[PDB]
Design a protein around this ligand. Sequence first.
Ligand code: CTP
Ligand code: CTP
Ligand code: CTP
Ligand code: CL
Ligand code: MG
Ligand code: MG
Ligand code: MG
Ligand code: MG
Lengths: 161, 161, 161
Amino acid sequence: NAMRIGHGFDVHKFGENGSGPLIIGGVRIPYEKGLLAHSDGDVALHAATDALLGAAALGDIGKLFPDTDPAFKGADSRGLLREAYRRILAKGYKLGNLDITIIAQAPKMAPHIPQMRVNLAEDLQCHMDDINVKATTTEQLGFTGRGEGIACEAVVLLVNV
Amino acid sequence: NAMRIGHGFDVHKFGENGSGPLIIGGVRIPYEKGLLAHSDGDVALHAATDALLGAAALGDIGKLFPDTDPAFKGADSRGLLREAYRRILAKGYKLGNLDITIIAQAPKMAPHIPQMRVNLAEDLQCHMDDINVKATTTEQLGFTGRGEGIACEAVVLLVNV
Amino acid sequence: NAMRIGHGFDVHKFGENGSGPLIIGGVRIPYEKGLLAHSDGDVALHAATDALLGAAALGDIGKLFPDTDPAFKGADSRGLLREAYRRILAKGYKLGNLDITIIAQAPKMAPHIPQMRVNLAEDLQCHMDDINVKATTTEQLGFTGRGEGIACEAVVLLVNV
Ligand SMILES: Nc1ccn([C@@H]2O[C@H](COP(=O)(O)OP(=O)(O)OP(=O)(O)O)[C@@H](O)[C@H]2O)c(=O)n1
Ligand SMILES: Nc1ccn([C@@H]2O[C@H](COP(=O)(O)OP(=O)(O)OP(=O)(O)O)[C@@H](O)[C@H]2O)c(=O)n1
Ligand SMILES: Nc1ccn([C@@H]2O[C@H](COP(=O)(O)OP(=O)(O)OP(=O)(O)O)[C@@H](O)[C@H]2O)c(=O)n1
Ligand SMILES: [Cl-]
Ligand SMILES: [Mg+2]
Ligand SMILES: [Mg+2]
Ligand SMILES: [Mg+2]
Ligand SMILES: [Mg+2]
């Protein structure tokens, strides 16, 4: 079977005005709060990993890396992504292309998108043209608009090698 | 045209502490409330049906099965899915693969995912490897995090027969 | 590379009981409020444009048409869509198919869907069978259910010409 589709969706709640600031798409972004989570809280990498595992019918991140397991407290999401991708390659698939939509009232994602694409293209061993990332606001509506957290949605295509 | 993409999204509000407990992905899940709806309220099957009808440019579930029509009060969502799939086959398409993301603060979906995949693979007459299901929390943010309802998002690929 | 996937997501907040009523999918829909936005606020066309640009790894609408730029105040979203599609064709891709899910408590989208599909098929120079549009409610949950805005989600497939 030639191609497979995958979808990922992930949310994190902000901490308080201590938090050690954002990592999104492997990029450290300046901000007054960070996202609370078992690992580094990288919403964009989580959504992307799930899209990949989902396309491969491998479940999701929780399947591969139990949230219960203390070996992943503060785990680097880029490492989790690379491991999942390794498994996807093992199963005979490689990335066709990926598209990510970050949903956050703030901070601005646009300055960091090029580096995010760099990190992803590295991690998924492909050309940067196979990675798209956008960011969008929720016009101050709902919990993202209220600034209580950031959500991220990802969509992916795997090609059979 | 070789392949077609489809997306589905569906939400249901919980009832009170009577409700007759969850059906999700055709699986009856133990819980203090059920989801109010015209049919059985199976959010995951609704999202999946819409993804399929959407890929086929057949509209959505409301198009095929009027919500107004009393013949579908408490309708089995698996039956609705099978009917839609019948129509998709009629139009010359079959499932490539499906991926589903349930968004619910509770109860835990993970124990039921294998059976959900069984029901879907049966319904869409395919191998279980063409079905992925994940569940995710919203970290207690928004109406799902607040426990007022469950949302579900589905993505699908149809292949031309 | 044969096919590319894209995802779009967009939200707009309603104005007050002046607002000059809805445009969605290029269709003017009767309503007591309109959606506030820099351009015409057409959530469905925005989500679709982003899905297209995202599949093409061209970023999103903000990339092509700065929100800062006064040349796009009240810009027609259909025009923005046509420009983006022009760029996608330039890059060697054409629409495979598109699917859109409008998320709105009200007004009813169903009466307008056929015209929306007409506008899109015109804009993306394809057959209406390559366009699907659905609408869904959020059962009065969250900010859409509360009627403070409308959200829209789009998914797309590009084929290499
Ligand atoms: N956290 C965020 C959110 C948005 N953006 C940028 O702002 C643009 C869109 O933001 P938004 O206010 O959500 O735009 P629209 O909803 O499309 O506004 P309009 O109705 O005027 O088209 C995006 O392309 C993105 O580059 C960003 O950098 N960081
Ligand atoms: N109703 C739910 C919600 C979640 N899960 C399980 O819990 C995992 C993820 O839950 P969540 O708390 O949403 O995880 P993350 O947001 O990814 O947490 P982290 O930041 O620590 O990675 C999933 O893989 C799923 O198996 C579940 O069984 N039932
Ligand atoms: N703003 C809206 C929202 C919904 N609809 C129509 O109503 C149907 C579904 O609405 P909804 O109440 O969201 O349906 P379900 O959630 O699927 O209800 P049920 O549980 O009974 O299946 C759709 O197919 C659509 O045609 C509409 O015209 N305009
Ligand atoms: Cl909310
Ligand atoms: Mg984490
Ligand atoms: Mg129902
Ligand atoms: Mg606008
Ligand atoms: Mg909400």
